[PDB]
Ligand binder design. Structure first.
Ligand SMILES: [Zn+2]
Ligand SMILES: [Zn+2]
Ligand SMILES: [Zn+2]
Ligand SMILES: [Zn+2]
Ligand SMILES: [Zn+2]
Ligand SMILES: [Zn+2]
Lengths: 454, 454
């Protein structure tokens, strides 16, 4: 059409309060890079699947969505095949994907998802409120399981009786080293500690039954909420309403750092399970393109950009630069040279290749790096940059001058000879045949013409 | 042909003693990335232009060369036009080039060079031997010019009479803020401190004549070599044979760090001129492709790779990893969050885009980063990764089970109800109609089939 296309994306959860500002900032970059704009509309947490499934079938046009019931819907033809789009529009994004993301999201030989590259493996963890651990001196060194959590819950119940000891909710189920390959509400798992060729009922796995017994003991003791089976209310990571909770953590979280940042306090973690790449971890955050989208190519271009352009993605995820965050350091690859490094055991940087991909030696200071950036930014061009002197009309005159120059120039230019004597001598020989003046005037004329852009 | 092509590059100067090792290491990468190999043959310093000009005209086949007399030879048709090759094979390399490199190397509307991205501007500098500055306590704070160098040369001549005070050679000429737009041995310059529209004779510029007078005074005093007008011998940066020398320095050198590294000692620098982008700085290190090359496309692919692949280029320029250098730090973009950052003023990383391009917050430790790398490397795949359960034969049985599950599961899974009572109750309802067993057996059969790859 006549305007740059606007691609509409549906997202799960509630909108940021500053969504207009975030999209303005993002769209500066998206418009510049791919000649389009992104509109993100949020559908809430509660009835996401319902809103996506039924209202889409008989209703509205869309380009991109956060997927619900991906595996089922992919088989029904709800989503545009991405197999060919990944070869061109999505080529950069595809290279960043762990092969498990491809295996996990392939349906009958085609791929229909853009997965967010992140916790391709993850583990279940207890997350502890560090403010309360410090206040009461409760040691968590022995905690490796629901069963071994008990002594620590006993301590917090005694010392701080109004804090919820283990803050869980109505979707809770005990975690183990299980693969639930199908997300359908049924009790069937592969026990990764048992026979991995067998489908088993979790309620018949002895250690899982033991966990349920433990949880029920916690219920009787008031260690978990009285209304756990019915409650919606979330526990704010920032507040001191809770002592321990269960969290999914993977390599993209960098240990306890992300939780501690979001909570703005010390959050300590102890793993309950091992990490593994499975359907659940590879399918958790999938974008799809509507099979009815009128902008399939541009939709992929935007997804490619969201997953490869750090200015764009950081602006959305950290929020507005200067209000939400600021830069404190830039990426630097450093080396130190060793005794093997000598003039004869390597090539020279100046005549081998782009010096800006060379690693930075240990003796370089941050000040020297910043000075180099400032100097590159401040440097101007000579007005004679790109000037070429055509010698066609003055061939023999240049040869005459150059021959005369070569007899004097080294003696004069090194200061071997006194210039007061040698320059007048040189100038007489250059001008004795008129070649000097001919070349000088031709050079000036062509330079005049160059500066006037003729 | 039948074999991966071997691209032959001619280079100026003398070969590294370990050239075979360097090319083996490089060619591992070049072969893998572009399906070709690079052969580099060195032609020496002395007669490079002669060897390149005449022996090429009537002699041998080649693909790539370090250019000599680029501007003249480009106009004669010696070099393959790169204008179109830069649009595909060289697209990444072209994006890394300062526009001055394009302007400086364009000849009659076409570009024939791959310039090394490096000191697009540079300045002339005095470089001092820091070992001698320290030993004798000679202060260089007042040195800004050839004239103001005199007192420091007087001091070293007195204190260390056998050291060469200002180590210059037969190609020396005093430097100034001049543009020599044509490299032809002639005396014509643009004075960047004067009228930049005029071509002038350097020997008539008053301050340049003054420099020659100064240099001649240095000659009479024994501050420069007695044989400067004839000598070939270089002064080794590593040795204490010299006190000051003149060096070209630009932003790619990071101040005095590169000189100090190559010398393996403190080298101090003082600039003589300003920095500017001109023909001399943009044309200094140009690779060309022979107009007679049988591998023009692959030649550009190799040049593109040399100028964009850090593993490749660092291997050649630093030399062999573990013998010549070792890694001490990897590139990291860091931020700190500010008071604006709250749950409602940004998007979530997990469902927005590739988390590996997100900047690293200040509270993340290097240990947490390394742990994340190790965990990503160690994580395995579930044997059920990619398993899809076809429900076609068990639709009503799944619905029956799922309905029964939804009546019990929250009470059991949260531990609200005692599992000793509730699990037997649940299991009776699931099996009362035989739907449980039907779904379990179908799931196991399809899983068996999946594991056998049917
Ligand atoms: Zn367990
Ligand atoms: Zn750094
Ligand atoms: Zn004299
Ligand atoms: Zn000067
Ligand atoms: Zn770093
Ligand atoms: Zn009970």
């Amino acid at each position: 059409g006549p305007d740059k296309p606007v691609i509409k994306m549906y997202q799960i959860g509630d909108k940021p309060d500053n969504l207009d500002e975030l999209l303005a900032n993002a769209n500066k970059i998206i418009e510049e890079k791919v000649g389009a704009k992104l509109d993100i509309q949020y559908l809430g947490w509660g009835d996401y699947g319902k809103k996506m499934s039924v209202i889409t079938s008989s209703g509205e046009n869309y380009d991109i969505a956060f997927a619900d019931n991906y595996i089922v819907n992919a088989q029904k033809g709800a989503y545009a095949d991405l197999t060919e789009l990944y070869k061109k529009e999505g080529k950069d994004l595809y290279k960043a994907l762990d092969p498990a993301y491809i295996k996990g999201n392939t349906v009958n030989g085609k791929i229909y998802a853009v997965p967010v590259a992140a916790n391709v493996a993850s583990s279940q963890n207890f997350a502890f409120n560090g403010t309360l651990l410090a206040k009461y001196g409760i040691d968590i060194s022995g905690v490796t399981s629901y069963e071994t959590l008990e002594p620590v819950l006993k301590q917090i119940k005694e010392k701080a009786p109004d804090v919820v000891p283990f803050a869980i909710g109505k979707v809770f189920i005990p975690s183990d080293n299980f693969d639930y390959p199908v997300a359908n509400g049924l009790p069937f798992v592969i026990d990764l500690e048992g026979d991995t060729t067998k489908v088993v009922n979790r309620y018949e796995v002895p250690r899982f039954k033991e966990h349920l017994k433990t949880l029920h003991k916690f219920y009787e003791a008031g260690y978990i909420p009285k209304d756990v089976a019915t409650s919606d209310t979330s526990f704010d990571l920032q507040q001191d309403t809770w002592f321990v909770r269960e969290e999914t953590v993977g390599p993209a979280d960098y240990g306890n750092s992300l939780l501690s940042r979001v909570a703005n306090k010390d959050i300590q973690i102890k793993p309950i399970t091992n990490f593994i790449k499975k359907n659940q971890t590879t399918q958790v955050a999938n974008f799809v393109i509507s099979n009815n989208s009128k902008n399939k190519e541009k939709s992929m271009e935007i997804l490619n950009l969201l997953n490869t352009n750090p200015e764009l993605l950081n602006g959305l995820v950290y929020g507005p630069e200067g209000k939400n965050w600021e830069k404190i350091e830039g990426k630097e690859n450093r080396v130190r040279v060793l005794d093997g490094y000598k003039g004869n055991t390597h090539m020279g940087g100046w005549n081998t290749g782009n010096n800006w991909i060379l690693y930075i030696n240990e003796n370089v200071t941050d000040q020297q790096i910043e000075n180099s950036k400032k100097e590159l930014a401040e440097a101007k061009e000579s007005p004679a940059l790109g000037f070429i002197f055509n010698t066609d009309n003055v061939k023999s005159e240049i040869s005459a001058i150059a021959n005369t120059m070569q007899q004097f120039d080294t003696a004069i230019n090194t200061g071997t000879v006194d210039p007061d004597k040698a320059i007048p001598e040189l100038m007489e020989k250059l001008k004795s045949e008129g070649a000097y003046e001919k070349v000088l005037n031709e050079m000036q004329k062509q330079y005049d013409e160059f500066l006037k852009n003729k």
